Structure formats: structure tokens, C-alpha cells
Amino acid sequence: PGIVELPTLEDLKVQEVKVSSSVLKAAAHHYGAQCDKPNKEFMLCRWEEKDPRRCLE
């Protein structure tokens, strides 16, 4: 019933955040305070589009 569209491996490339879980939890509160706008934009996209392929950017 059709081919599933998938992104290329290059579109999925990004600079990774390679800190560990305890490092993330130590900075979690300030990180949620400072980086709120892009995070909320991505979550609104994710919950409105219902498709990970539409919110990669």
C-alpha cells in the first residue's frame, strides 16, 4: 500500500550531547530554565504532527 518515506542518514546527523545521565540531572533545572523556547517548540511540533519525520529540524 505504498513505500514508507524515510530520511537519509545525513539528515539524521547532529552534534551529539555526550554527557552522562547524572551530568544531565545535575544541570536539569537550569537547563530547563534556559533552553525552554526551542524545547517547547520541538515538543509542540512533536505533539501536533504525530510524526518524528516532520520535526527533525
Place this chain on the structure above:
Amino acid sequence: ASKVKQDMPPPGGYGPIDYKRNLPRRGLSGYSMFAVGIGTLLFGYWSMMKWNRERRRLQIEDFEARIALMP
């Protein structure tokens, strides 16, 4: 001319011997025991109330960390 020597009680008599039951009372009152129990329970309830409220706040903070990290 030796006199008769024989196992006999001492002159006068032996010291009196106790035989009646001796079970002392040895306790508090019922009211006091119950009162101590309820007082301990109330102290425990108050301590647990404070500690569980603090635990609720700490869990909220832990959950907010996850909410911040989720995106």
C-alpha cells in the same frame, strides 16, 4: 556417764517458715498504659506527616528534572 545425744530441734524453736502465696501486684493502671500508647501513636503520626510531606516535595523536584530533560 555420757548423756543422750540425738538429732533434735534447737532450744525454743526453729525460725518461722513462709508458706502462703506471694504474688505482688506489680504494674501500672490501665488508663496510664492506654494513655502512653495513644501519646506514642500521636507523636509518630505527626512525625510521619512531616516526613511524607517533605518526600512529596522531593518527588516533585525529581519529576521536574525529568520534565526538563525529556525534549
